[PDB]
Amino acid sequence: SMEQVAMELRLTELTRLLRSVLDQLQDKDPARIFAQPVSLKEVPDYLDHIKHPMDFATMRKRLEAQGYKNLHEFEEDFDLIIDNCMKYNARDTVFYRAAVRLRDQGGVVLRQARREVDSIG
Numbered sequence: 001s002m003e004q005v006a007m008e009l010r011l012t013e014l015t016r017l018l019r020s021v022l023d024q025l026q027d028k029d030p031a032r033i034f035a036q037p038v039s040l041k042e043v044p045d046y047l048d049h050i051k052h053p054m055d056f057a058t059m060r061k062r063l064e065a066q067g068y069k070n071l072h073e074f075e076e077d078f079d080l081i082i083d084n085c086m087k088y089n090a091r092d093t094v095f096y097r098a099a100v101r102l103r104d105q106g107g108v109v110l111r112q113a114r115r116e117v118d119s120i121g
């Protein structure tokens, strides 16, 4: 149907917008702390601590399968990146502080993304 097609075109345009968002977020992480999964072969106890690991590469894979139906879903995954880091690592560490800074800077990006998604429909 043509109604199904129109829904598909909308999902594709949201995907495009969320790609630009993901690139902007990732530019706020020049050290590439959040780029890839934590290796279970180097924080071997990681999964006893953190139940739902997340990273930017994992988000990109979901994005390319048009796997985010709305901005809220994408935001949840970004918040897992930040939140997991703030739990596993202590307040005094470079990792925790990098997560605080990424959350602050990503706030700006996400705030406009919401206005654009709302505005475009």
Ligand code: NA
Binding pocket: 086, 087, 088, 089, 090, 091
């Ligand atoms: Na902690």
